[PDB]
Design a protein around this ligand. Structure first.
Ligand SMILES: [Fe+3]
Ligand SMILES: [Fe+3]
Length: 180
């Protein structure tokens, strides 16, 4: 079914509120919700919103500071592939880490924009990209969308911010599973 797959996701999400914040300022649920809030606010399609909603899903579905889970972009992507999510949502989520490594190596002042948690994890994710590694990232057809998502992940750290719950994105997740 599709109503149960999303019922597991919303269950996985709501339980992140009870976790260890992984060094951030808001719990892992508000971080997920604010990203989807900023994604939907920009007028982006449903695929971009869901990707931002589940970009750090690999932190609590199964070693980094500890400020997170190893390959949380890969683990989070693989988990959604099993549910039937599109490859676009998978790669956008899997490329959210590489998006930061690109922005840091490109913008000489992007490190300050980073959270304390995200900066510490960079020393586990590969640090600043080399000259040749950022070459391949720019070759991606979703090179634009990957940078927009990471911008929402850095912006989604607000403490005094009201954001719709996971139930607001339930219908969006159900319709997405039907298209695939
Ligand atoms: Fe992340
Ligand atoms: Fe994040």
């Amino acid at each position: 079914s599709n109503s149960s797959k999303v019922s597991v996701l919303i269950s996985l999400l709501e339980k992140s509120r009870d976790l260890d914040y992984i060094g951030e300022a808001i719990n892992q649920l508000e971080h997920s919700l604010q990203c989807a809030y900023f994604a939907q606010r920009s007028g982006a399609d449903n695929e971009m919103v869901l990707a931002a909603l589940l970009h750090d899903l690999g932190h609590y579905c199964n070693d980094m500071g500890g400020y997170g889970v190893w390959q949380h972009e890969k683990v989070g992507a693989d988990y959604l592939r099993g549910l039937g999510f599109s490859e676009r949502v998978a790669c956008l989520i899997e490329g959210h880490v590489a998006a930061k490594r690109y922005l840091v190596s490109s913008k000489a002042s992007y490190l300050k924009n980073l959270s304390d948690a995200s900066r510490k994890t960079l020393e586990y994710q590969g640090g600043p990209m080399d000259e040749g590694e950022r070459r391949l990232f720019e070759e991606r057809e979703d090179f634009k969308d990957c940078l927009k998502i990471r911008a929402w992940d850095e912006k989604g750290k607000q403490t005094d911010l009201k954001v719709p719950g996971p139930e607001h994105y339930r219908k969006m997740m159900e319709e997405h599973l039907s298209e695939n």
